[PDB]
Structure 1
Amino acid sequence: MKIIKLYFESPVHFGEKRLSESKITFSADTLFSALMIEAVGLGKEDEFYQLASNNLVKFSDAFPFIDQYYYIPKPMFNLKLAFKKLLYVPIDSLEDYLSFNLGKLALSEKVQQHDFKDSEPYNVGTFTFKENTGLYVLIEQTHPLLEELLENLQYSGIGGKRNSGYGKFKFEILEDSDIEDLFSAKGNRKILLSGALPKDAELEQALKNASYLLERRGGFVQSDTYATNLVKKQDLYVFKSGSTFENSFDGDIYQVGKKGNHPVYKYAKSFFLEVSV
């Protein structure tokens, strides 16, 4: 299980629903859509689409990491049960759970100035990591297409207020030894680590003793060829990447969008971390 470690040289803006705010992680929707925007410039969109669709390349969303430690969002267990406010927990110590801050958020105030009418101020919510800190993306069975799609993405940036100028990173695809056998080992309750949406034939058994939190995924399509107008794509309500389950599923690459010149994809596959509780 390789590790796509991302060190950032710039403050980043990963928007949720507004430009003024930003979260500290990008979802796997953003990472897959970013990688496939990099693929369409290479003329290799279908190879990447069929590489993900045949479950060969399958990645999580971004999680924070600090020096030597890898963190994940708090698994909302359906427990029968200070330490109350810990939004991120380490991936090494989860089985025994049954101090932390990375950088700070900011709001970089900007304008759109004009000569003969008054300027229009606006805000862009940033997030600056520390110098020993960044994000990581889990990946199984890395690929030379994936290895080079990250090589173009570091010179086009990830996040929102790219191009001006916030997404800038330098990846290291790295391989780890104590967190590949956290995925080889298994328990009985399967926590989710991606923005997954179960298919309609398996949703009703996916949520049996589930404790989830739906997060809406929408926004406008980002291409200059989709019907020559910046048009919103239909909203997809997926589970959060810190939810737990009892019956595992497999998501899909949903094509969120009506009439247009290319299929606008959204990564809603799953990536489970089975643990005993």
Structure 2
Amino acid sequence: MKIIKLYFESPVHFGEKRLSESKITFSADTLFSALMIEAVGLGKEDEFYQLASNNLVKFSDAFPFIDQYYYIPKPMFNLKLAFKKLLYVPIDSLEDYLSFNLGKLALSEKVQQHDFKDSEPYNVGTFTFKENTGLYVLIEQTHPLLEELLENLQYSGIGGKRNSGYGKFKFEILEDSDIEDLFSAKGNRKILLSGALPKDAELEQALKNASYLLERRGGFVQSDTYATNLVKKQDLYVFKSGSTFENSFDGDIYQVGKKGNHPVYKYAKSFFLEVS
């Protein structure tokens, strides 16, 4: 199981509800949406969907990482038992569990001027990473196709505010074996690592002793082909990445657009870190 490390040399804007604020990381269907839009840039979008639909391409979402420390969101248990301010724990320090600051959020103030009229300002929330940090994306069984797409994505930009002028990155794989054995392990409680949602006939079996938050996950369709306007998406509600489940489930790539000239998918497949 491989690593995908993302080094940003420019600020990022990962919006979650509005342009004025931003988020440290980006989700999994955000990266999958970027890969779909770039694959239909290359025309190979159909067999990329047939790869990601049949589990050979299965990635988690982005996580913070500092120099030789890979992080995850604080897994949230039914713990009966200060470190309550900390949002991220190192990925190998879960056994110890049972200082940290990457970057700083900034707000960039912009304007749009009209020539024979008064101007109008708008402001963009940004995030800038420190010099020896960034984000990393977990992936198992790397494919030549996704190695080609991320090689091609880095000149289009992950992030929100494009193409002015923020999201750009250079990636490298840099596989690791100190944390592959964590994912080869098996335990009794399995934490989630991506924004996921089980299929309708297994949500009950997935929902037994869980600890989760829903997140709304919608927005606008970003294409020049979906139905001659800016149509919103069917707001899918997926589990938060810092969830825990005692029993596993497998997600689906749900179609959240069913009215334009092409389908709009949303990645909601599961990715577990099994722990005792």
Instruction: Sort the TM-score into its range (normalised by shorter chain).
Output: over 0.9
Match of 1:77 in 2: 77
User: 1: distance between equivalents of 2:174 and 2:265?
Assistant: 27
Distance in 2 separating the partners of 1:259 and 1:216? 20
Matching residue of 1:109: 109
Give deviations 1:145-196, integer Å, cap 9, x for gaps: 0100001100000010021001100000121011100000111100000000
Matches of 2:94 and 2:121, distance apart in 1: 45
CA distance in 2, matches of 1:66, 1:184: 24
Equivalent position SS for 1:146? helix
SS at match of 2:94: coil
Following superposition, the deviation at residue 78 of structure 1 comes to 1.5
Distance apart, 1:115 and its partner CA: 1.4
Maintained 8 Å contact 2:255/2:263: yes
The whole-number CA distance in structure 1 between the counterparts of 2:208 and 2:200 is 14
Using the TM superposition, give the Cα deviation of residue 62 of structure 1 relative to its aligned residue in structure 2, in angstroms: 0.2
How many Å separate the matches in 2 of 1:98 and 1:113?
56
Name the SS for the 1:92 alignment partner: coil
Are the equivalent residues in 2 in contact too, given 1:233–1:258 (CA < 8 A)?
no
Q: How many residues align?
A: 276
Residue 31 (structure 1) shift: 0.1
Deviates more, 1:112-121 or 1:96-105: 112-121
What is the alpha-carbon distance in structure 2 between the residues aligned to residue 208 and residue 144 of structure 1? 38
TM-score, with length taken from structure 1: 0.99
Quote the offset at 1:52 in angstroms: 0.3
- Alignment deviations for residues 103-153 of structure 1 (CA, whole Å, 9 cap, x no partner): 100000111111122111111000000111100000000000010000110
Q: Deviations over 1:57-110 (max 9, x none)?
A: 100000010001000001011112211111000001012201100010000011
Identical counterparts, % of pairs: 100
C-alpha contact 2:193 2:242 (8 A) present in aligned 1: yes
The structural deviation recorded for 1:258 is: 2.7
Offset, 1:219: 0.2
Counterpart of 1:175 in 2: which secondary structure?
coil
Aligned to 1:87: 87
Contact 1:111/1:119 (8 A) holds in 2: yes
Contact kept in structure 2, 1:5 and 1:137, CA below 8 Å: yes
In the alignment, the residues of structure 2 paired with residue 189 and residue 162 of structure 1 have an alpha-carbon distance, to the nearest angstrom, of 40
Whether the 8 Å contact between 2:13 and 2:159 is mirrored in structure 1 is: yes
Contact 2:13-2:161 at 8 Å conserved across structures: yes
The answer to whether the 8 Å contact 2:206/2:249 transfers is yes
Distance 1:56 1:257 in 2: 24
Give the equivalent residue in structure 1 for 2:162: 162
Contact 1:35 1:150 in 2 (8 A): yes
8 A Cα contact 2:258 2:264, kept in partner? no
TM-score normalised by length of structure 2:
0.99
When the two chains are superposed, the root-mean-square deviation of aligned CA atoms in Å is 0.7
**Partner SS for 2:165:** coil
1:16-46 per-residue CA deviation (whole Å, 9 max, x = no partner) reads 0010111110000100000111100111001
Gaps of 5+ in 1: none
Following the alignment from structure 1 to structure 2, what is the Cα–Cα distance between the partners of residues 28 and 10?
21
